[PDB]
Amino acid sequence: TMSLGAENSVAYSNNSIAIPTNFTISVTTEILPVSMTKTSVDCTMYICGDSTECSNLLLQYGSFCTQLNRALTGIAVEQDKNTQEVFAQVKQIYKTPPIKDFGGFNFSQILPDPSKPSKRSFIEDLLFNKVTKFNGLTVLPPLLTDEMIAQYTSALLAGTITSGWTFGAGAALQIPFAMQMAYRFNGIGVTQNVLYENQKLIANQFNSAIGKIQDSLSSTASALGKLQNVVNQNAQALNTLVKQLSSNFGAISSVLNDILSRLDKVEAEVQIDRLITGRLQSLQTYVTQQLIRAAEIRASANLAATKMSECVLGQSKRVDFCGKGYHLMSFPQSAPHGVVFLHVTYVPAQEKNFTTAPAICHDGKAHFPREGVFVSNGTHWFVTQRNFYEPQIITTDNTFVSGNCDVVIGIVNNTVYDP
Amino acid sequence: SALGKLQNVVNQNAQALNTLVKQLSSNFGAISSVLNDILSRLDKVEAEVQIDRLITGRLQSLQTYVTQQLIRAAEIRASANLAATKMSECVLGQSKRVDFCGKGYHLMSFPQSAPHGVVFLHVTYVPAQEKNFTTAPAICHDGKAHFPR
Amino acid sequence: KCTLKSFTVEKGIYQTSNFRVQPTESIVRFPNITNLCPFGEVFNATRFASVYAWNRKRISNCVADYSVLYNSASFSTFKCYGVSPTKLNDLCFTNVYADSFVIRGDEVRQIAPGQTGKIADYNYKLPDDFTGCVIAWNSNNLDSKVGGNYNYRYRLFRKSNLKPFERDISTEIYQAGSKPCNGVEGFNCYFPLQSYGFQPTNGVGYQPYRVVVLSFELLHAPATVCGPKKSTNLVKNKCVNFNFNGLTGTGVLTESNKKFLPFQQFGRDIADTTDAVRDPQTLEILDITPCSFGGVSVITPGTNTSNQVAVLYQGVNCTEVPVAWRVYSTGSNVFQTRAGCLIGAEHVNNSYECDIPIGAGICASYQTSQSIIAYTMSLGAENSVAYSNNSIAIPTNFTISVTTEILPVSMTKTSVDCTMYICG
Amino acid sequence: AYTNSFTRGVYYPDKVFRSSVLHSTQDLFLPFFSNVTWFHAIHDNPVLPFNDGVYFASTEKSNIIRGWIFGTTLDSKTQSLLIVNNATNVVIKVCEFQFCNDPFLDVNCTFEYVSFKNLREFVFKNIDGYFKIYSKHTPINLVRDLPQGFSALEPLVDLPIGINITRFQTLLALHAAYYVGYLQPRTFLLKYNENGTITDAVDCALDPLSET
């Protein structure tokens, strides 16, 4: 019987709070499909193999082969559109600055590498290495080449590093990277001095966390499973459609020229009609499953485009929408048939207990915190921000007042200082 | 050509219905596309063979249309849920979601009706006319580090 | 225009046709044997055997002019199954077998697949997919002898129900008696060879009929019984129609290093389709491809702008489509691309933004001297953020945009009364 | 006396070249890890029933075995398959006659045709009424058993003879080891390499992993 994980009782009370005394950065991969292999099929050539006798007979079915062509053309065109929706959001090819003093943070794994024949990052090459017929079937190029995709992932990354949110809304504005992380910290309720007082620790954690992702992507192909499914399924569907040429459907042979050579028309055309009826039904089956599989990819493309706009171009407030923990920032990397995000997030890391009260009474008046929470070490009363222990003396600056003591449940006596 | 996203839905239904009607004209291997020819020409014992070809052909054409409309309706429904979401988040509110309620910083949105659809006028603030400045993350005075609010 | 059912065409790239290279020659190659097949031994022998004891002969390694038999108007039947009778002069086979006997003319019915009755159940049977020909003719001129040719014999009975092509000769009395018969006749106890009294005065069905059944070892394997057929000179490395030993096709015949062991006669693809043959007269292993094919995408501005046009032949090299439409194949200029060969469009280096998409970063537009031009698309303009470790830019003004967005919400409600649709 | 077949007894199933493909087909094959009957060159050469077809092999250095007989009954009444190598030629004939009665060979038959370290392997089966022979030679070094490993037997001949074989026996030069097992219908997976050699195979019915 499977276990649903470790069992835990939280030490709750009417007066106990735990506050974290330290943090850790983390970087979490997320992988999404965007565009499957662009196929196309001429049913006339597939069904009848250049027999004019068969081809004339196929006209009795009317507008079937033209509408199956139109259906696969519809699928094949929106694969370029999905790739436009996800990557081509940025209106200019921004390029990386020549000096790398981003406050000690080290993007050299994810920025493009000029040594490469195609201008990809170090990590994009791990992605590209981990991911793994003539019967009137055809397979078509994407509009954007893989090299062009690597230019958009270069531009998005360079704008994000050098200019924060601003290149999404306006023109890209320069800003020092240490200040960009301070303003991202300030978006998650952690006061910005927590970054500047720890900048070297934070950079060391971040550079180490990027380092671990090369090792993650070196360890197993199973991480790429979502993209590897796209490749597997279209290849499986095609080989099923090709092997169906060999099926009899109750005709004397599945090699159409056997019928046309061994038999005259009055015998032959019934045998040809069995093969026609078979192959046409088998091709409708292939096209119908592609229409459904195309919508399955379309919802994944629109989800990827949503994360691109809400995270790479911004900072998402939305819980678990761009990595677990409190979200700071994200970087895209290009991949076969899809996109990869490296979400960067803040996790509070060393819990400590404190005694707490919702309000203090002093002057006969109830005091409440302007920001953060009241806490005590067992003798003194302090106020702290919610997400990182930083005890301050309670004053008429960091508190505000509402009425006499008597209405609040569990108010406590202490002085409040007036500087 | 701004309204192609609506006009396409009208065009696809016209194309599907015309193709569905035109398949009545196809023989499917019967002696005629028109059922009254067989009934005026042939004895019932033979007509019941010819008519089974027309039933089989017409039925296969009809199943294809209905199957296709189920898929096409699922695409419209995804767009309708999205429209209902932009209605609640952009019209009845103001959105923090970057680029969701139009490009730029979102202020407000106005809906207008359209055939088979809806049109939003998203109103958005966009910054302009930069100046450069020198900057520093903190200020020193009396040896204390001061940070801005 | 005809592809779209329209007198007017908008800007775009349209599918219109699927081009194929046409066969330049028609090769035939064949088993090299010349000796005529022994049809005189089959058809003109002194006696065919008794029907319970029906004779069989192998035919191999000979040339089979079935027109000789087809023109034999004496044949009271010449019925064939799995082959239309005249095709035998060109279709060909590994071996063929002749079964032969004399029968009562009434019982000629039983010499067909799926038959039943005393012969079909007890002394000659064809399989349900019998492939070949049944021949019979009245032989009352020879095999009638005033009844006295009683040699022609069959089972009434026996419980040994017969397999297709089963030989038997047994003379044992039917043992299924009221007592075990053990060489003595009685109820069910009868001798197993009832006979025809072939008199010249017999009724037209009681008369003797001579029989031949040509049953064919019709297979993809090495043919040895084959109709009279020329073997041509060979063509290589060029698109041709071909036949080898009855195996039809069209393709490029080409030289190879497919290391067939001496028994291996054909190469097969991953999807098990033929992709090489050992030539029957030369014994070289020819590797084979289909003749070249591809979609014919037509690239145009709107007709309301210009009638002028360009063509993309998808997937194919320009060097394999040097055909002759006439003008739209010479084109004054022709540009090879990663998508295929592009004809008539004028190649240009200036990277505009994309207009009509070709594929693999190529696009086309109508431009100045007016022509369809083709170029590598831009991704957008280049920019360089002036990042420096103490430098910030702040906006001093703003503008309020109004941005349109358009969504479909519904589609036409319909219903079909399917009995009124189907049955009128 | 017995030993184990392991993965011996594969042969090229059709007259076709394929390469780089894991193709699969149904035919009479020797089932994997089945037992085989064991014999050695003393006194050891009885008549055996033929069943649906025979896998036969012998390990020799001096050609002790020279031939085989097959038929219903080996009786001087019916034409019966005789196979010999007569030191100068392969020889095949369908004699009735016990011109030699015993499996001993001294130091009207219608159809006729002519053409430890040495392991000789064979598969004999009848289909089309035709007698179909597949073959291999190899050096070997294991003493007691069929050597555990793989090799695909190559076709020889496809003979138009039509005999009701129910029994068979081998023939010996007179004044080494040999082994017998019986074919069964199986679906096999077959590994055609780049050079179109059958290099490995699966007896799909053998166990649940083989089915998988």
Ligand SMILES: *[C@@H]1O[C@H](CO)[C@@H](O[C@@H]2O[C@H](CO)[C@@H](O)[C@H](O)[C@H]2NC(C)=O)[C@H](O)[C@H]1NC(C)=O
């Ligand atoms: C917060 O936790 C981190 C570890 O996650 C602590 O960082 C380590 O600190 C010790 C010295 O105390 C060093 O030897 C390690 O090398 C540090 N690790 C790294 C990655 O630099 C950090 O000290 C904790 N903060 C507080 C205030 O306790």
Ligand SMILES: *[C@@H]1O[C@H](CO)[C@@H](O[C@@H]2O[C@H](CO)[C@@H](O)[C@H](O)[C@H]2NC(C)=O)[C@H](O)[C@H]1NC(C)=O
């Ligand atoms: C940024 O990080 C990379 C590794 O992620 C550093 O690359 C190493 O550089 C040293 C020389 O300084 C080489 O000996 C190593 O072999 C490099 N590592 C790899 C994996 O190739 C790089 O030095 C860092 N740069 C800065 C300015 O911090």
Ligand SMILES: *[C@@H]1O[C@H](CO)[C@@H](O[C@@H]2O[C@H](CO)[C@@H](O)[C@H](O)[C@H]2NC(C)=O)[C@H](O)[C@H]1NC(C)=O
């Ligand atoms: C609760 O926190 C306060 C402040 O850290 C502690 O009070 C100081 O304690 C030190 C000795 O550890 C004295 O030198 C200071 O004079 C105290 N300051 C004041 C303003 O009283 C207090 O000791 C802590 N209590 C506990 C139980 O840990």
Ligand SMILES: *[C@@H]1O[C@H](CO)[C@@H](O[C@@H]2O[C@H](CO)[C@@H](O)[C@H](O)[C@H]2NC(C)=O)[C@H](O)[C@H]1NC(C)=O
């Ligand atoms: C908080 O402090 C006040 C005094 O500032 C305490 O109030 C006294 O409470 C007792 C018992 O109810 C009364 O006898 C006195 O008359 C009260 N004095 C005043 C000035 O109100 C109060 O009890 C303290 N509460 C706690 C929980 O510490």
Ligand SMILES: *[C@@H]1O[C@H](CO)[C@@H](O[C@@H]2O[C@H](CO)[C@@H](O)[C@H](O)[C@H]2NC(C)=O)[C@H](O)[C@H]1NC(C)=O
């Ligand atoms: C094939 O040969 C076998 C014997 O080798 C024949 O079957 C046996 O025939 C004898 C009489 O000759 C019977 O007494 C036995 O009962 C038969 N065996 C069995 C298992 O019943 C068989 O009939 C021959 N078949 C052909 C078509 O020749």
Ligand SMILES: *[C@@H]1O[C@H](CO)[C@@H](O)[C@H](O)[C@H]1NC(C)=O
């Ligand atoms: C907090 O204190 C309670 C006292 O019972 C203890 O059970 C709990 O483990 C403590 N938790 C932490 C985070 O120190």
Ligand SMILES: *[C@@H]1O[C@H](CO)[C@@H](O)[C@H](O)[C@H]1NC(C)=O
């Ligand atoms: C808190 O709970 C304790 C018992 O757990 C109780 O004695 C005390 O009166 C409660 N105080 C408040 C403010 O609810």
Ligand SMILES: *[C@@H]1O[C@H](CO)[C@@H](O)[C@H](O)[C@H]1NC(C)=O
């Ligand atoms: C800001 O000053 C730098 C000085 O090198 C210059 O490169 C940059 O273009 C200036 N930007 C604006 C908005 O004036």
Ligand SMILES: *[C@@H]1O[C@H](CO)[C@@H](O)[C@H](O)[C@H]1NC(C)=O
């Ligand atoms: C059979 O003999 C006649 C002459 O008696 C001859 O004309 C005919 O060609 C022969 N047919 C065959 C098949 O040999």
Ligand SMILES: *[C@@H]1O[C@H](CO)[C@@H](O)[C@H](O)[C@H]1NC(C)=O
């Ligand atoms: C085939 O016959 C031709 C003459 O018809 C001869 O030149 C050629 O050598 C023969 N080839 C073989 C392999 O028999």
Ligand SMILES: *[C@@H]1O[C@H](CO)[C@@H](O)[C@H](O)[C@H]1NC(C)=O
């Ligand atoms: C068609 O011609 C009209 C003027 O007659 C022009 O306004 C329009 O832009 C043209 N459109 C195209 C697609 O050629």
Ligand SMILES: *[C@@H]1O[C@H](CO)[C@@H](O)[C@H](O)[C@H]1NC(C)=O
């Ligand atoms: C096109 O064909 C020529 C030979 O005719 C060959 O040299 C060239 O490499 C081919 N190019 C492409 C892109 O197929």
Ligand SMILES: *[C@@H]1O[C@H](CO)[C@@H](O)[C@H](O)[C@H]1NC(C)=O
């Ligand atoms: C285009 O660029 C190529 C080299 O890439 C050069 O040979 C050619 O002359 C250029 N053509 C034009 C029209 O600029």
Ligand SMILES: *[C@@H]1O[C@H](CO)[C@@H](O)[C@H](O)[C@H]1NC(C)=O
């Ligand atoms: C093979 O034969 C032996 C006797 O030598 C017997 O014990 C064994 O059970 C047989 N093999 C199997 C798989 O049963």
Ligand SMILES: *[C@@H]1O[C@H](CO)[C@@H](O)[C@H](O)[C@H]1NC(C)=O
């Ligand atoms: C083998 O048989 C052939 C005839 O096919 C004969 O010429 C030869 O002498 C025979 N050899 C022996 C040793 O019997």
Ligand SMILES: *[C@@H]1O[C@H](CO)[C@@H](O)[C@H](O)[C@H]1NC(C)=O
């Ligand atoms: C020769 O064989 C035939 C069958 O092939 C048989 O009828 C005949 O009796 C046999 N003769 C001798 C001498 O055994």
